[PDB]
Assembly symmetry: D2
């Protein structure tokens, strides 16, 4: 029988050292590998092309996503970059979501201005906006679900089938939920990618990406382009990332416990105008998220009553929510997308996406529920004292 | 509120970098630190004496245990060696447990044979044996609870009060439960120590130790001795250990779920003569463990029916229990104490400990309970097929 | 005075830690950095965009090359990729050397097939071939000198001036000599780039790249593109790379001592048909290399008498020259460019470059001259025994 | 031929990976190694006992010193502690030098006060003081040559023969010259040890120690005791240390060049009362150093004219000599032994060592000789301006 996803993450590279029988995999930093006499390349030759420590992480994320293999890039942006270079050429069109990560928006828009591809920026949750984008015969559709930072939910089965009907490949950015909470390849997607910086690593001490292809042929094309462009990651970073992955299933139980308790505090608290969290029955996308996700996750964002003064008072004095970029760490974080995560967007693209100036995003960590709730209650008082 | 234990473990070193505001603490590998001009030592001078990355792990273990300070050593045995050198000299007597870790037994017996101290090896679970050791006016009593590998429960209240009445210091090896599950200092111990190699690091990729003193002055004596003897550990190892500590709570919730289910399978199974697990109501010590511990942990051992042939058949074919030394890893492990963890002991001292040639010890990981039970049931069949 | 290049390399990041006064710089792995309250970005925010450990290496290479700043990429190919994306768009033409690194050939040819730019492949050492390339109004000319693997020398001042006259930017791949042996920006080049994998790191345990721009504005454009494409390097790799740089000047004295003694053995030895080494007065490019370089380096290639049988016998039995890819490490290496480093080129592109099926390339390390010479003499005998 | 010292250091662990043929050795962090089925220990079982990455550094130091084996410890002081515990018991006498490292003095005086052994502190450069110590039938003599920080030269032939005639073991602290410049085991010492923190690592980013025994049985005793006491170091530190070792020869060529130039400046400069540097023909011990060493090294100390005010003015404004502890780094360093390296000693034991309150010690780096002399001349002016 096969093991579960949780077993496979915990045991990736365990007892797989033929040299010494090390239980925990050795770090192979070596740039280079000997040939076995003249003309006899071993399995590995050069670390930019292939490295065994990085391949343990690739093979582990491929097992977790149900793919034919994985490529580990220096950054998550690099994983998106790898997919655009492998799949697209001038004259091909790309469809992307309106409310994707601001750095995704930045790369799509910079590479389209150069004419590497034509860009259609669409709302993939509105059937009309989708059908108009697919009727332009795109080579590639990118889905980001749940979306950063408003947690809009796109219907994987629906969009993937509609993309296949017009001959488009699909790629899903699965960063916000990780493989442990969403498996886009199960619904027929061709590619899934991550910022490993987030949950997969879990300790905010690695920036990395991953791409997993369903098909062996498309995996080989990603290996070729990652080598030729020089986008592959450092073995040290793969080592820490693999170490991280071993606690992903354990981390996520505590994250989701904390996130449910915090959603219940923020939803119809008098100082809170709107919570965006797919776990609330009132959230547009809740029933989709409960169907295509194994849990509702631990990212959420919210709008305070009381304009900019309430935001400043809420944020200044948080002891357990560090005001910082990134997400998916064991440590709780808060960000202000307008000035931080989505500062790379124009004011116009933020307004089209529906990211206000008052929006705060929480990355809820694995600290004790009680300490996070006290911290958030004190912020809600500092905000109220602003009226 | 100060924070909970889980919050303190998650947040140790977080947002505590004055140079750049790094969220996650920088690794300070440097052997040396500049003076602030002639005659002005800064806080740090030299890594053997004091290092800030090491001191983040020291401070976090002191906070979790309730102590004045911590000293991080290169190994767990190094921690035991630090306490013996800081506290004892020739003419002092040390009391230790009969069923301690065999590497502990090896060090106690080697240093006693040199004349560094006189040794009394006693059953600290039995009032009689304890009172006969305390009648000899020891300088120091060492407690290991629960004990490796039979999980005997020493009564902390009882043994620490009786030792204080004869003027003895107490030290507890708290390796097997970690600070998250037992706090010997709350019972009045002078010292608690750990192999951080186990649950504190949690990833089987560091060997380390720590000692936490209740009292500031004994903490300064340990700092002095660790520096003089050169027993302090590496900043890189401290970074990995602090990183592992952040998931200690999350890991222990899965370790304990999995161990409660495996105990249920082995207790009363036709192929199991004996199970040693403090969480079983029929383990002597259950009621004690329920009151001095916050959980029953995830270490257990057991004796199969069917002699040597049953042991060999059980062990050959385990897929998810790696036959290896150590414990407290995310990865499940099995050991044969007689030929592995306790081979450092004489056949005689093992018989006095009541560690038999058939004993198997499990360190239960954080893999899916379903996989670990399928693996153990197939082992129990393979052993049954032996009769 | 400023210090010398050697002083600056040895002391890059020495005594620059404001937290503790650490003599050697801390490793800042953190993905993220706190804000200093709401709206107050610190100097660093996110490691893909900027990280202080990577910036020490950036700043050190910029100081060594005489530039406004340095960007550190995951790989050397990545550094080339960063320059092609920052500088070129469809319709711009690029001029590259005919005998550049085969991975450079692969990337140029793959992005030109996609139409990211038009490609002119020229012999930059032949005036006619250059003037015909420059008469086509290119946006960018890339020079690789000395060339891999034939050590062809291109006249930096000549080519850079001819490029400035038609409005072209120049970029020089300075991997083969490092900043310590050639400074292309001194001759007016706009950009210099390296595989830090080679001499700068020096220890074959990092794959990395660097790009240094003369002008502050072009440096800012590289920071922008490196962030948006996600091409930035791991801080751990920057740490090891900086540690490596500290011995570059010391390593290169022994490399060049060993290379001079090996060129003298190989040149007009009866089994050696041709040596390509810029230190020989007979080498096309010697007087140029003596003018525009501070030494002749430690890369060289050679052609044995006796066809494929002589190659196979020379290579099989080398004790001190490991048959592997890469170069610039303290360990001596040998490669066969046709089947290894230049296997990415078509047979047609190799023949146009003048890379035969018989060519061997040596990366001469810092072992004792005597042991390397014995190893090479025994290889020359095994080669002679095949006639 | 076997290879030279330089070749052995460069090539230690090169091409010695059976799993992938990694050129540079993998980092084996694992605490634990699997058994090959029930009852079959592999070569490695547990990192505290034995680790292959650590053993590559042990084996390379043994090869360089001509011994049977090496044991790598967490610190240099840990190496001294290992030897004291493996060899001595109460009733034994140890002879140590009057002018040893102050941390050595602290350990000897602390463990003698406990009664672990009787201590004789003697001037081993003076025949009379030596013979009076040897007339007491010591179990062990420790030599430190050259001595920290006055560079006194002990006669290895003389002291080791005199100690063998009374049945005493000898151990030499070879920290100050490294195996590349002195080999105590060629003179018949039983043991040689190092702070690997200094020249062997060479990059001021590891604290470590090593002990090499001439005889295979004493090496086995050191392995046993290091294991039992838990003094063994971290695999990560061994990896960095072996990495630094590879440039030991190249670094020492520059260190020695720079040190000969600085000795030339300080010897008979009008502001310099005394220089202690074995390479000066007038240093007592010159002729001995010339015969028993392969170079005079790069440690020196000196006494300025002009009392405390001259010291303070010399030290304030040094740009290239960091005021800090340690030595043997690529970075130049300056220490005040009385307030820094030797503050662990009493004013009396310093007076007996003849370490005055005016003494400054230089660790000369591999920066440009021209820069280090500009820095020192400006320091000498600043001190002159004081009269
Ligand atoms: C959904 C999604 N996909 C990709 C990524 C990529 P990676 O590893 O950081 O490269 C992310 C990352 N999101 C992050 C990173 C914010 S950093 C923005 C500031 C920086 N100064 C910049 O210019 O980029 C987030 O939403 O916090 C994501 O949410
Ligand atoms: C209760 C307890 N205290 C201390 C330690 C110390 P450390 O980090 O390994 O130094 C332990 C470790 N127990 C471990 C490690 C045992 S491995 C013994 C084999 C080795 N060949 C040897 O000779 O030592 C265990 O019981 O698995 C412990 O259980
Ligand atoms: C001159 C030059 N510029 C750039 C680089 C780039 P980097 O760090 O490896 O990414 C190099 C590297 N040269 C190297 C690397 C050869 S690895 C070839 C095999 C590999 N299987 C592949 O497909 O690429 C060399 O010439 O040895 C160079 O010589
Ligand atoms: C000759 C010699 N033997 C051993 C050592 C051992 P290790 O790696 O530091 O443990 C040394 C070290 N010399 C170093 C020691 C750094 S001084 C540290 C002062 C510190 N606050 C303390 O109390 O110890 C030196 O002389 O600079 C040596 O010179």
């Amino acid at each position: 029988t096969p093991c579960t996803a949780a077993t496979a993450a915990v045991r990736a590279g365990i007892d797989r050292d033929t040299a010494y029988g090390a239980v925990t995999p050795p770090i192979v930093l070596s740039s280079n590998f000997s040939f076995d006499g003249f003309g006899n390349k071993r399995q590995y030759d050069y670390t930019r092309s292939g490295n065994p420590t990085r391949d343990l992480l690739g093979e582990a994320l491929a097992e977790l996503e149900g793919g034919a293999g994985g490529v580990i890039t220096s950054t998550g942006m690099g994983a998106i970059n790898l997919v655009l270079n492998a799949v697209l050429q001038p004259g091909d069109t790309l469809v992307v979501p309106h409310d994707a990560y601001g750095g995704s928006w930045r790369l799509f828009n910079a590479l389209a201005k150069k004419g590497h591809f034509a860009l259609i920026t669409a709302d993939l949750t509105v059937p009309r906006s989708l059908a108009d984008a697919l009727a332009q015969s795109p080579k590639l559709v990118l889905i980001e679900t749940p979306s950063n930072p408003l947690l809009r939910i796109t219907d994987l089965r629906f969009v993937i089938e509609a993309a296949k009907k017009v001959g488009a490949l699909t790629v899903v950015d699965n960063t916000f939920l990780s493989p442990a909470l969403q498996k886009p390849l199960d619904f027929g997607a061709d590619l899934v990618l991550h910022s490993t910086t987030k949950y997969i690593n879990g300790h905010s001490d690695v920036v990395g990406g991953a791409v997993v292809a369903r098909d062996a042929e498309l995996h080989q094309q990603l290996v070729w382009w990652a080598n030729a462009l020089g986008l592959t990651g450092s073995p040290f970073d793969a080592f820490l990332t693999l170490r991280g992955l071993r606690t992903l299933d354990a981390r996520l139980r505590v994250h989701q416990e904390n996130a449910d308790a915090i959603a219940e505090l923020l939803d119809g608290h008098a100082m809170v105008n709107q919570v965006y969290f797919p776990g609330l029955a009132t959230h547009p996308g809740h029933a989709l998220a409960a169907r295509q996700q194994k849990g509702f996750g631990a990212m959420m964002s919210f709008e305070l009553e009381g304009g900019e003064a309430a935001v400043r008072a809420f944020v200044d004095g948080l002891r357990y929510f560090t005001l910082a970029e990134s997400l998916g760490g064991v440590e709780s974080l808060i960000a202000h997308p307008a000035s931080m995560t989505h500062a790379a967007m124009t004011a116009e693209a933020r307004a089209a996406a529906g990211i206000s100036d008052g929006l705060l995003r929480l990355s809820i960590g694995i600290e004790s529920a009680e300490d996070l709730l006290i911290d958030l209650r004190a912020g809600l008082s500092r905000a109220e004292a602003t009226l």
